[PDB]
Each structure stands twice: as structure tokens, then as C-alpha cells.
Amino acid sequence: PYTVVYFPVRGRCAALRMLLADQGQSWKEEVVTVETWQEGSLKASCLYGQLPKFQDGDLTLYQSNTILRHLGRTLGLYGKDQQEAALVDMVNDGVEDLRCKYISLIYTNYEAGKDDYVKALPGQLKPFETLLSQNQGGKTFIVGDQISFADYNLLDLLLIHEVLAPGCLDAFPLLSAYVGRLSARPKLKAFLASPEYVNLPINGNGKQ
Amino acid sequence: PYTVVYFPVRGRCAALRMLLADQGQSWKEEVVTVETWQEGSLKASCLYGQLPKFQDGDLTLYQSNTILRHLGRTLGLYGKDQQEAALVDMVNDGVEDLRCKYISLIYTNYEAGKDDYVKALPGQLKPFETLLSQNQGGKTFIVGDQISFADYNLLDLLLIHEVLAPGCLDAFPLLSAYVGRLSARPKLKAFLASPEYVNLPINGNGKQ
Ligand SMILES: N[C@@H](CCC(=O)N[C@@H](CS)C(=O)NCC(=O)O)C(=O)O
Ligand SMILES: N[C@@H](CCC(=O)N[C@@H](CS)C(=O)NCC(=O)O)C(=O)O
């Protein structure tokens, strides 16, 4: 079955976890501690020297988006055809791009860069609102009429940004409604409210 | 057919171009000039305000890796099964990660950061050598026994790094042989030697 090896934080595992929870899939969590990481062996055994590490049977994966695409592929959350699959990738690449900027701020220069980051945030969120406006008035999902792995990744990105900049979605009606709608999905709602999710920090340096 | 809209540089379009050339596909190049970009209208019309922009029929795409995955998916260069597709993604994510570091150096702090970057390079290339060593002794491709879009992306990454740090592949027999072998593919060889490729700078700021 599934095993996710990661630090005790939501981080880059939050989206795939929401995905697995919402899809009614079971998985095992293998928590890695500082001591363990700092010990070096595990790290050295990781393809790119980083976590998450994911196991699906004897298939061992690295890279959060690889895991997301794998689950999307095997679980049927990658578009209804090749055209939708491409749009799904386009959304996820966009999500990853903003996530990289967010991670840089959080771990690299939170104090000094927070103001500029937040001023620039609307410009960075606009593209997703636009995608939403172009797909059934933004009443279903980010791509097509079925959920995809990019939805889970985008939802996570929006969630962590509302904590960083409360009300940043006030300027985007479709995105706001989207967050509320997806967050209300029964299995996802229960997971998001659980101690398993709630009691984990968003990041590893205590900033958010 | 295919149309790629980009600046007159290899950059993030080099890999998908090598792919199209090697696969015997025809495409149109729409070159964007400073004046044109600086004008602002094109940029404003881009999903994430960036190029490349790709067109396949009435399907318009953005993000270099989205285009690579699209072509890999539609042309059959995405693994023989779901397991291989996942490994292909894992390699590409790794390639993208190093590419991001390379781009940062090139455009952000070439002079001051080149020494440290080059010292750290071996550690960054090691994972791809290992992947090769684990796939048929590294005698075929990065994943499986058929070429995939990750191969073209990795090949490009290795090619631009040899220019940045000549001989960086010397200590990696599999990667070295891999570059030579793939570069020798008839259609790819002809394309790489053509003025269309050769007379284009690697980057846009004249550094390499
Ligand atoms: N591109 C990778 C990034 C992985 C990454 O940044 N991992 C961090 C934590 S989220 C890590 O392993 N840090 C420990 C280290 O680099 O030694 C992915 O998407 O999974
Ligand atoms: N994640 C995007 C990055 C695209 C990107 O960085 N584009 C640059 C040139 S390679 C650009 O459009 N720069 C102009 C601008 O940002 O205004 C991709 O993979 O295509």
C-alpha cells in the first residue's frame, strides 16, 4: 500500500495527504526526526537527498509532485483526456512556482521579505482565479468537471496563504468559493479537522 | 500543428525543441523581441506572464515542463507503464530542480556564486549517474528502454553544464557516455549542429 516518509510538518506532503484522505485511501506515516535526519544515513539514501520519500508497494518515489502525479495517474485524478491532463499539469506547475516563492520567504527571509511578498500576492493568485472563471464559471474544479491532483495542490497553496496573509482571497470570489467548496468535501473536511493534520505545523521553522 | 513562442534563446525551450526535432516533428518558431516583450501586451496575455507559450492546434499551453509532458504524453515518450511514467516524472523533477539553481546563478549572481556552484555540481549530478547505473548498466535511457521527455530535458541540462563547467562529466562514465550516445541520434545530431540551435545563445544575459 502507501507509505509517506517525512518530517513532522505539513509542508510538501499536505496536498498528497489531502488527496489520499479525500479519495478514501489508507496510508502509513513514517515520521523522521531531526536526530534521524541529522544522522545522515536516511538522507544519503534519498535520491536527491531529500524527503518526502513515498512507497507504493516496492515502488519508491521522491519529489512531492512526482507523488502527486503518480496518485493522480493511478487514482484517475489527471483529467478526462490528454488535453485536460495538459491543463492539469499547467495548473500544478503554476502552483509549484508560487510554492517555491512561499518556501523561499518562509525559510530564507520572512521578516524582511514578507511585505513585498504580500503586496505581490494578488498578482500571483490572479492566474488561478482566471482559470476558474474560464471553467464552468468556476463552479466545479480547476480543470474540467472532475477533481484532479492539481486541485489538492492548489487548495493547499491557497490554505497556507490565507494563514500567511489573512483575507488574501477576499479579492478573488471564485478562489474563495472554491476553497470553501473543496474544504467541505466530507472525507477532506474530516481530515482537515483531525489532529493528524491540525496538530502538525505548516512548516519546519515555526513560521507561517 | 506546433508553434513555440519564445525569446531568441535556447533556455527553457531547448529540451522540447530537441524532442520535436528528434521525433521528426515540425513546428513553427515565433520569436519575441525585447521591444515586443517590454511593450507589455503579450506578457499580460500570458497565463503566468511568462514564455514559452506553446500551441498545438487550438490548445494553448504555458510552462516548459507542461509542454514537455504534453509532447511526451501525446508522442509516447512517457514510459511503458504507470511505474515508468512515475520514474520519468521523478527524473524530470530532479532536472527542473537543478535547472532552477542554474538559472538563479546565471541571472542572479554568476560572478560571486560560480565557484560554490561548481564545487557543489558533482553532488547534484551524482543522482542521475546513479539512476543510469540502475537501468541496464546505463546503456539505454534514463528510464526504461525507450526514450522519454525526461531524457531530452536531462540531456539539455548536462549539455549546458559542460559549457558552464567543462569536464564536469569526466568523473561520471554513464552520464558522459549517455550524452555522447543521445547526441549521436541522427535527427538530434543534425538539429544540434544546425544554425537554428548553434546560433542561439544559451541564456538571455550572455552568460553561460
Ligand atoms: N523538489 C523536492 C523538494 C524536496 C525538499 O525540499 N525537501 C526538504 C524538506 S520539504 C528536505 O528534504 N530538506 C532536508 C535536506 O535538504 O537535507 C520535492 O518537491 O519533493
Ligand atoms: N516555470 C516557467 C518559467 C518561465 C520563465 O521563467 N519564463 C521567463 C523566461 S525563461 C520569462 O518569461 N521572463 C519574462 C518575464 O518574467 O516577464 C516555465 O517552466 O516555463
Curated annotation (Swiss-Prot), chains A, B:
Keyword Cell inner membrane: no
Alphabetical UniProt keywords: Acetylation, Cytoplasm, Lipid metabolism, Mitochondrion, Nucleus, Phosphoprotein, Transferase
Subcellular location: Cytoplasm; Mitochondrion; Nucleus
Leading EC class: transferase
Chief location of this protein within or outside the cell: cytoplasm
PTM annotation (Phosphotyrosine): residues: Y2, Y197
EC number: 2.5.1.18
Domain (GST N-terminal) ranges: 1-79
GST C-terminal domain boundaries: 81-202
Coiled coil, from the record: none
Residues that bind glutathione: Y6, R12, W37, K43, Q50, L51, Q63, S64
Pfam (any one): GST_C_3
Keyword hit for Ubl conjugation: no
Catalytic activity: RX + glutathione = an S-substituted glutathione + a halide anion + H(+); prostaglandin J2 + glutathione = prostaglandin J2-S-(R)-glutathione; prostaglandin J2 + glutathione = prostaglandin J2-S-(S)-glutathione; prostaglandin A2 + glutathione = prostaglandin A2-S-(S)-glutathione
SUPFAM superfamilies in the cross-refs: GST C-terminal domain-like, Thioredoxin-like
Function per UniProt: Conjugation of reduced glutathione to a wide number of exogenous and endogenous hydrophobic electrophiles. Involved in the formation of glutathione conjugates of both prostaglandin A2 (PGA2) and prostaglandin J2 (PGJ2). Participates in the formation of novel hepoxilin regioisomers. Negatively regulates CDK5 activity via p25/p35 translocation to prevent neurodegeneration.
Family according to the record: Belongs to the GST superfamily. Pi family.
Name used for this protein in its record: Glutathione S-transferase P
Gene from which the chain derives: GSTP1
